[PDB]
Amino acid sequence: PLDLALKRKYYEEVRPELIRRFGYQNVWEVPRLEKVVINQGLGEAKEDARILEKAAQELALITGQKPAVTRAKKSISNFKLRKGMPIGLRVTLRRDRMWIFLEKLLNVALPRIRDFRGLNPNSFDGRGNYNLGLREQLIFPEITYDMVDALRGMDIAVVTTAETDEEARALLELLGFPFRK
Amino acid sequence: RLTAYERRKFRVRNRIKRTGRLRLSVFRSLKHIYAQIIDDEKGVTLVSASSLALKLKGNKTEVARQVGRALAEKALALGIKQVAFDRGPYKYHGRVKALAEGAREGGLEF
Amino acid sequence: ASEVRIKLLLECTECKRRNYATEKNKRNTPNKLELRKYCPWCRKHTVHREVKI
Amino acid sequence: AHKKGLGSTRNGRDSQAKRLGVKRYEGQVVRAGNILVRQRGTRFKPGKNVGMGRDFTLFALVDGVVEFQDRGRLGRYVHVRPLA
Amino acid sequence: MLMPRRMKYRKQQRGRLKGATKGGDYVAFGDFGLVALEPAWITAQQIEAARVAMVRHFRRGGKIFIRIFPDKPYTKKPLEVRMGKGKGNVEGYVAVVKPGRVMFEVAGVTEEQAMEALRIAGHKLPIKTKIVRRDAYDEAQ
RNA sequence: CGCGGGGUGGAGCAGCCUGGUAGCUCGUCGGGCUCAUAACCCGAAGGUCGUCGGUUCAAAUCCGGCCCCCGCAACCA
RNA sequence: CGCGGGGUGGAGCAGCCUGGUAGCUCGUCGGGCUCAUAACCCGAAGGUCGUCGGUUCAAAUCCGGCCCCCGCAACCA
RNA sequence: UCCCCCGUGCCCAUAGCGGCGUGGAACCACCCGUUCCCAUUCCGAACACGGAAGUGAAACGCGCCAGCGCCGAUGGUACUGGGCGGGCGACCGCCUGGGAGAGUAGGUCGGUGCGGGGGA
RNA sequence: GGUCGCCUCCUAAAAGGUAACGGAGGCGCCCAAAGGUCCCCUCAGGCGGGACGGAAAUCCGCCGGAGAGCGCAAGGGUAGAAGGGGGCCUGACUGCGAGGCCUGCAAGCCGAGCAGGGGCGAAAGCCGGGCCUAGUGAACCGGUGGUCCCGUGUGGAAGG
RNA sequence: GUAGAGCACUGAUAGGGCUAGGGGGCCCACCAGCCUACCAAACCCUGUCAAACUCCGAAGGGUCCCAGGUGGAGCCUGGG
Numbered sequence A: 001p002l003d004l005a006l007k008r009k010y011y012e013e014v015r016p017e018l019i020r021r022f023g024y025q026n027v028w029e030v031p032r033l034e035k036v037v038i039n040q041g042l043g044e045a046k047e048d049a050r051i052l053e054k055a056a057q058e059l060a061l062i063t064g065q066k067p068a069v070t071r072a073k074k075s076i077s078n079f080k081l082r083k084g085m086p087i088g089l090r091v092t093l094r095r096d097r098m099w100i101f102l103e104k105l106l107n108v109a110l111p112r113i114r115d116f117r118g119l120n121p122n123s124f125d126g127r128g129n130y131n132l133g134l135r136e137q138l139i140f141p142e143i144t145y146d147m148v149d150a151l152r153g154m155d156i157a158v159v160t161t162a163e164t165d166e167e168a169r170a171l172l173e174l175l176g177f178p179f180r181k
Numbered sequence B: 001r002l003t004a005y006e007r008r009k010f011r012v013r014n015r016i017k018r019t020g021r022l023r024l025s026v027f028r029s030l031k032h033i034y035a036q037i038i039d040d041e042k043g044v045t046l047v048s049a050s051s052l053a054l055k056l057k058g059n060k061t062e063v064a065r066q067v068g069r070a071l072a073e074k075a076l077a078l079g080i081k082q083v084a085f086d087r088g089p090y091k092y093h094g095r096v097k098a099l100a101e102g103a104r105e106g107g108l109e110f
Numbered sequence C: 001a002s003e004v005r006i007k008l009l010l011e012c013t014e015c016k017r018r019n020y021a022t023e024k025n026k027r028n029t030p031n032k033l034e035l036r037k038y039c040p041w042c043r044k045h046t047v048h049r050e051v052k053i
Numbered sequence D: 001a002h003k004k005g006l007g008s009t010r011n012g013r014d015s016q017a018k019r020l021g022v023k024r025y026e027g028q029v030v031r032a033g034n035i036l037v038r039q040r041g042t043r044f045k046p047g048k049n050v051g052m053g054r055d056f057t058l059f060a061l062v063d064g065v066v067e068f069q070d071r072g073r074l075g076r077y078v079h080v081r082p083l084a
Numbered sequence E: 001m002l003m004p005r006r007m008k009y010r011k012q013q014r015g016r017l018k019g020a021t022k023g024g025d026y027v028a029f030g031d032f033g034l035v036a037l038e039p040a041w042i043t044a045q046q047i048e049a050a051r052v053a054m055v056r057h058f059r060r061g062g063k064i065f066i067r068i069f070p071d072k073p074y075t076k077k078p079l080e081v082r083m084g085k086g087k088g089n090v091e092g093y094v095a096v097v098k099p100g101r102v103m104f105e106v107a108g109v110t111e112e113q114a115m116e117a118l119r120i121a122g123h124k125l126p127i128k129t130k131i132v133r134r135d136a137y138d139e140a141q
Numbered sequence F, G: 001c002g003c004g005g006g007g008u009g010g011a012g013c014a015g016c017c018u019g020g021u022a023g024c025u026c027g028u029c030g031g032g033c034u035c036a037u038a039a040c041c042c043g044a045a046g047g048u049c050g051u052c053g054g055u056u057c058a059a060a061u062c063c064g065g066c067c068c069c070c071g072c073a074a075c076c077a
Numbered sequence H: 001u002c003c004c005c006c007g008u009g010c011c012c013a014u015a016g017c018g019g020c021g022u023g024g025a026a027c028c029a030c031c032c033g034u035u036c037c038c039a040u041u042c043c044g045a046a047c048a049c050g051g052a053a054g055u056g057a058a059a060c061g062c063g064c065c066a067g068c069g070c071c072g073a074u075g076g077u078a079c080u081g082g083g084c085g086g087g088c089g090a091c092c093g094c095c096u097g098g099g100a101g102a103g104u105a106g107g108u109c110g111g112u113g114c115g116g117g118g119g120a
Numbered sequence I: 001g002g003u004c005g006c007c008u009c010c011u012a013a014a015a016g017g018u019a020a021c022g023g024a025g026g027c028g029c030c031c032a033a034a035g036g037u038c039c040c041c042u043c044a045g046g047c048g049g050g051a052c053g054g055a056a057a058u059c060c061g062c063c064g065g066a067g068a069g070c071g072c073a074a075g076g077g078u079a080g081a082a083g084g085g086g087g088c089c090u091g092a093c094u095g096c097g098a099g100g101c102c103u104g105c106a107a108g109c110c111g112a113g114c115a116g117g118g119g120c121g122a123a124a125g126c127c128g129g130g131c132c133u134a135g136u137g138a139a140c141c142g143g144u145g146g147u148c149c150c151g152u153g154u155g156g157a158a159g160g
Numbered sequence J: 001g002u003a004g005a006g007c008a009c010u011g012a013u014a015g016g017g018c019u020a021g022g023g024g025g026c027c028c029a030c031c032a033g034c035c036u037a038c039c040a041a042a043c044c045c046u047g048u049c050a051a052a053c054u055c056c057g058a059a060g061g062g063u064c065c066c067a068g069g070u071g072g073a074g075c076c077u078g079g080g
């Protein structure tokens, strides 16, 4: 479909290591990335400016996909929040577009962050998936300083077929996910 | 618990069953497509046409059209002409559509 | 009804007869009501518009 | 003498009776149009030759004989078998 | 003083007291119990009164069980006023007891001690009563 | 027993009708003037709205019960 | 239903008859004087002149519609 | 006319949850691809189309086991239509017919219809 | 003093109905989408993981039959949709109406089907407002728009 | 959909277990270890309660068909 870097490392290096490590019988048993979802939980743009599209153009830039809106489920008073208010962005990366984002993340994003000292090991799902948080977003290379108004974080979730954290730990560690402890 | 698959099925099937007409049901596997005609009063298939049984092949849509046409042949012979189309969990489009389009000019009233 | 949910007639633009009577919210939908409706006089359909009750 | 500081009653009302229920039973002969069940929600569901009105009223669509059916989890149904 | 913490409804219709007790007819906790012989609305005042009497009797010792609870609101119209103009007010809570219902139980106190204590208790209750010992029949239930 | 009103910073009153936001005067505390006190000037703190429930995204505000205060009523014999 | 006249800055407001100026008082800001307080005095921010369409070189000023507040009188089976 | 599979009804958990095992010849499914039809408030996930390299890992089909869930007698009793009796009274009791709920024994890892494809 | 019509629940004794100044609550509105249809989607809640971010904003995972939602009180109903999103639309039709529910009258209620001219749908089909049950007022008197039926010898006009 | 009965729903409920949080003391505090004959949500076991609770549920009651029933029965129209 498209020859890419990280997909090669998975298929030509990560795969076999996993097999010899847990002794998978069948081929599809071998754990693999299903999808990567980015979610900028804004709501800072609630009643406020529709200039969440600045964060949206910034988003589509990083991912190469157009981001969708997320709106208020229930209204909450303590949050100054009306049910239906636009309060976030979410974009779902699958197949090749996933592989590209992950390559630029493990290689260029994650190092360029202030005082990187490893990903949290305990942050594993319990049924094979993994979650992390960024606060910057100029951290991605295609975002120069001039494009930014104010900072903005995002919620990355990465989903694998791994039955458990162990298998998941390995699939990620082997790809290039640097862990802290 | 229910898949959206099953929910769609019931939802479109039940509506048709209420109109009391004969029912042209359809199955659309990855490799074939099948279409039987059912009297839900008695719970019985009156006539059936399929790709596997036709020993047919040559692009899914163009194939699908024929099984419809073939279905009409055996149907009209028996007396069946009036019928309702169970489009199953499948969007009325492409392959399923072609089956309908064929079965239409094949003589079926629907 | 109320001062705000008001009553009104629908008048056929073709032949000016009022053939239907209904309501609307004045605040919510403040424009005159445009609607196709059957005319028994013209014996076809017709764009009818709102008319003060 | 007697009639001292008594009281009052903050409630004390009700609505009119609505005469709901099954109106024709299993085995009863019926004309098309006959009301079969007055109800709130589908406590019964329309079956063969039975239609349902906007307030959930069940009526016969054909002359025939009324027939009931409990299909367990699928609910209860009123039918009308036509007559030859 | 027993009474519900919260209540779905504040006033409750009176009802009859048909039949024997619905259940709670076998000893379930201690060795001896007090059984109702005739039915009644047992006031929350009476429950408490019996309770205290036993407690007091064997000062510090044993454990008292109470198998009845006043959840029925008891109504009373004011003095010297006439019929009508609404239902009276809630003025206390009773527990509906019926013959066969074990109402109290005691344990971990000597047989003689239990007998007197349960006996005094019954004297507080508005009905005829009997003491009973835990049976093979009770443990079977 | 009945009917109407009320309870909000230490005192005395607004805000409730129309739900989102707590005001006024006094007092108080800190700093000025004065030899000193007051008057006077500058600056500040202080309530989680009688009490339980309920409605609501949200309650001093809307709804039910209870408690305390206030006014009216309580006649024919 | 039928009449009469208003909307102009944060509050009230003559400018409208007679088309060339968004002006006045009070309000807030800064400065002068002050035992201080006011009052006095100098300056200053603050408006699409209800809307939309229209005659006009130009109109809050004049027209048509429409919104809204007040006002006048009558009717209410 | 026995076996396996596919579509589809009926009985509506004795059919379900969970566990363990089995199945790719065929069917079916995941699967391969995004040119075309169609599609995503983002994503070929879904829907859709063109395919057949791989795999039964998932899903599904078929088994097996009774932890769960579900079903659940007989016997007895509550209550009761009708007919009576005792007690000042509170309430009890009798005949006749009907007869639960709970619980006990125990059952269950479905049964069947019509069509299609493939077998021995 | 309280109440007076309508709706929901109990009282109501397993059909319907049933009283009291018996026990609890609601209504006198609302929506041009909260309506018609076609297509798609499925809750609440719990646990785990996740920058700002909390009990609760938005994202991921597993569980979950309905305890959510259905404008509003309650009941019944309901995910095999009546709920959530979208596309196109005005059937929130006109002329009728076999047959019944309810019922003292007068009211109230459900309704297939026929014709006209439409809507959405490939189609079967659905559509004569809204998940349903409250959201209301006989007749008399008058207003407004139609029609062109009567109109005092005739044609107009007044008035019906 | 009652009598009875039941707790699966809406609430109530005594004891015990388990266990968020809350309180007293300790360590003494900055965060954490607290251990607790106290208070206690959720949950589990024993044991119960309810007109406006029901996983259940009779006896009866209602209506329809067939049969008996000829009675100061019954049905239709009208006068009092």
Ligand SMILES: [Mg+2]
Binding pocket: A001, A002, A096
């Ligand atoms: Mg590619």
Ligand SMILES: [Mg+2]
Binding pocket: A010, A011, A012, A013, A014, A015, A016
């Ligand atoms: Mg490899």
Ligand SMILES: [Mg+2]
Binding pocket: A042, A043, A044, A045
């Ligand atoms: Mg925010």
Ligand SMILES: [Mg+2]
Binding pocket: B001, I065
């Ligand atoms: Mg389920």
Ligand SMILES: [Mg+2]
Binding pocket: B003, B004, B005, B007, B008
């Ligand atoms: Mg679906």
Ligand SMILES: [Mg+2]
Binding pocket: B007, B008, B011
């Ligand atoms: Mg559906």
Ligand SMILES: [Mg+2]
Binding pocket: B041, B042, B043, H009, H010
């Ligand atoms: Mg059948």
Ligand SMILES: [Mg+2]
Binding pocket: B056, B057, B058
């Ligand atoms: Mg060929």
Ligand SMILES: [Mg+2]
Binding pocket: none
């Ligand atoms: Mg052709």
Ligand SMILES: [Mg+2]
Binding pocket: B081, B107, B108, B109
């Ligand atoms: Mg034909």
Ligand SMILES: [Mg+2]
Binding pocket: none
């Ligand atoms: Mg035209």
Ligand SMILES: [Mg+2]
Binding pocket: C026, C030, C031
């Ligand atoms: Mg208007």
Ligand SMILES: [Mg+2]
Binding pocket: C013, C014, C045, C046, C047
């Ligand atoms: Mg027209």
Ligand SMILES: [Mg+2]
Binding pocket: D001, D002, D003
């Ligand atoms: Mg007297």
Ligand SMILES: [Mg+2]
Binding pocket: D004, D005, D006, F001, F002, F074
């Ligand atoms: Mg009095």
Ligand SMILES: [Mg+2]
Binding pocket: none
């Ligand atoms: Mg009062």
